[PDB]
């Protein structure tokens, strides 16, 4: 299942007096933590969200984000005039560690949707898109030895130890195999659009194609793998053909949960 743990940030600045931060905890596409901004407390979305960490380390982590979120807005609102920024603007952030080809930690920043900074060998690498602001900010944040030293321990010491423990604490919900459900339907456009629906599969990798007996059809138009509540996926594979062409056609679905017996729907 998932191989990376990361926390995300979205701070919305409307006027010189108002700001609002949004944060959450993720195992790739699956949300395990939330953040209640009103109290400054994390929301454990699964019983195994705390991993193997005791309530002593979980509370310490919650405090760092509580302090970080509360303090984040006043720092950037005061330095908004310094970096010639005009309201409204939006800050984004992502950080955490990922198992690779062996764990690799990461941190990324973004203003107005465009890249702002990245971290390589515990250093403020600006982003070419960010411009002079990214150059000024990385030259400014270096001085904040308290912030710099906390992000180090969080990236390279507490995160890798957390990633391993949370993957194991909830393998029953990460490694599980959910069988999908498939059905067929007709599209609007003599000519017909043959729609196939595969709903409720887990994990995300899936094989879906339209077939002529044992022969694949190159003209299949696989849609976006859309999120389905809760922790399942949704997909549609369309086919545009003649009115007579429909005869002898089938939608074939292959997934890990299916264990050899693939979903074969004719029409």
């Amino acid at each position: 299942g998932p191989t990376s743990f990361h926390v995300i940030q979205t701070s919305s600045f409307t006027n010189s007096t108002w700001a609002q931060t949004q944060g959450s905890g993720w195992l790739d596409d699956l949300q395990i933590h939330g953040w209640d901004s009103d109290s400054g407390t994390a929301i454990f979305l699964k019983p195994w969200s705390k991993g193997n960490f005791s309530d002593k380390e979980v509370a310490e982590l919650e405090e760092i984000f509580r302090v970080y979120i509360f303090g984040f807005a006043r720092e950037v609102q005061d330095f908004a005039g310094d970096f010639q920024m005009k309201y409204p603007f939006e800050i984004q952030g992502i950080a955490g560690c990922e198992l690779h080809s062996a764990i690799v930690s990461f941190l990324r920043g973004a203003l107005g949707g465009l890249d702002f900074l990245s971290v390589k060998n515990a250093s403020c690498v600006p982003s070419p898109e960010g411009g002079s602001r990214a150059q000024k900010f990385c030259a400014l944040i270096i001085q904040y030895q308290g912030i710099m030293e906390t992000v180090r321990i969080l990236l390279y010491e507490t995160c890798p130890r957390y990633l391993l423990g949370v993957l194991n604490a909830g393998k029953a919900d990460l490694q599980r195999q959910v069988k999908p459900e498939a059905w067929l339907s007709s599209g609007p456009s003599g000519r017909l659009q043959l729609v196939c629906h595969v709903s409720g599969f887990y994990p995300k990798p899936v094989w879906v194609m339209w077939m002529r007996g044992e022969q694949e059809q190159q003209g299949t138009q696989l849609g976006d793998i859309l999120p389905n509540a809760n922790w399942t996926w949704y997909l549609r594979a369309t086919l545009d053909v003649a009115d007579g062409e429909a005869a002898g056609l089938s939608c074939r679905v292959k997934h890990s949960s299916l264990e050899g017996q693939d979903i074969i729907l004719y029409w």
């Epitope: 405090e63 303090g71 904040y144 030895q145 308290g146 912030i147 030293e149 180090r152 321990i153």
Partner: T-cell receptor, first 108, second 119 residues
Framework: KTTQPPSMDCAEGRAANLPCNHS???????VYWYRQIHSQGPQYIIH???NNETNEMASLIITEDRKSSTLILPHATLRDTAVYYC???????????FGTGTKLQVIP | AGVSQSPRYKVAKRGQDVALRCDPI?????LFWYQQALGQGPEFLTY????????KSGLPSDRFFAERPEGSVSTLKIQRTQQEDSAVYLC?????????????????FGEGSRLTVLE
């Protein structure tokens, strides 16, 4: 969790080395020194989380080992007779805990 | 620019209520209350982040109560004062801003309020 000698005599004009012990002193645990004169509240002297600092009043040296710190008063004056407190503060924490400190006696 | 504590000295009759005030430096988000007994270091009582009392673990009894309604001026109220309450109540404020270069992040203490409780 800091430990410091309860008393210390220093000769006037000499350097006063004020020792402080703390088991961890993490990369983000700070070291703050405060001074307290009779019938007064504590006053900030110097701080440092990594780099040894050298301000206009004193100098702070954190061991590369990080399990002890020392406050250096280059030339002790009579005005330096006070209780010196060594406090550790994790970067994101606001609460500051004071121990019993060191009673520095600058002998005229 | 300093923290003002009042009354600087207070004589009180045992069983009476006493109210200690602390006017911190304008803009300082953090406000801390401490109690200091003879030959001992300051002891934490309560901490405020603006008007919110986030940690009050150091309060000696049911009778000690602190408030900062507008997130500036604080008042430590001691009810039914006892002889054991005789101490120097210290108040400190701190900017609570990220510490870069020239930001000491220090605690600015008041002059203190010496409380003496007599029968």
């Amino acid at each position: 969790k800091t430990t410091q000698p309860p008393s210390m005599d220093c000769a006037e004009g000499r350097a006063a080395n004020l020792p402080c012990n703390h088991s961890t002193i993490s990369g983000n645990e700070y070291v703050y020194w405060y001074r307290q004169i009779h019938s007064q509240g504590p006053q900030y002297i110097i701080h440092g989380l990594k780099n040894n600092e050298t301000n206009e009043m004193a100098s702070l040296i954190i061991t590369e080992d990080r399990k002890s710190s020392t406050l250096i008063l280059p030339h002790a004056t009579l005005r330096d007779t006070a209780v010196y407190y060594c406090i550790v503060r994790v970067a994101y924490r606001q609460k500051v805990t004071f121990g019993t400190g060191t009673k520095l006696q600058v002998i005229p | 620019a300093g923290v003002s504590q009042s009354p600087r000295y207070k004589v009180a009759k045992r069983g009476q209520d006493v109210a200690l005030r602390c006017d911190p430096i304008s803009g300082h988000v953090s406000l801390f209350w401490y109690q200091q007994a003879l030959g001992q270091g300051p002891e934490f009582l309560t901490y405020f982040q603006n008007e919110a009392q986030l940690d009050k673990s150091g309060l000696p009894s049911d009778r000690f109560f602190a408030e900062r309604p507008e997130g500036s001026v604080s008042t430590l109220k001691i009810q039914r004062t006892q002889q054991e309450d005789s101490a120097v109540y210290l108040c400190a404020s701190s900017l609570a801003r990220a510490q870069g270069a020239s930001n000491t992040g220090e605690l600015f203490f008041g002059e203190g309020s010496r409380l003496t409780v007599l029968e």
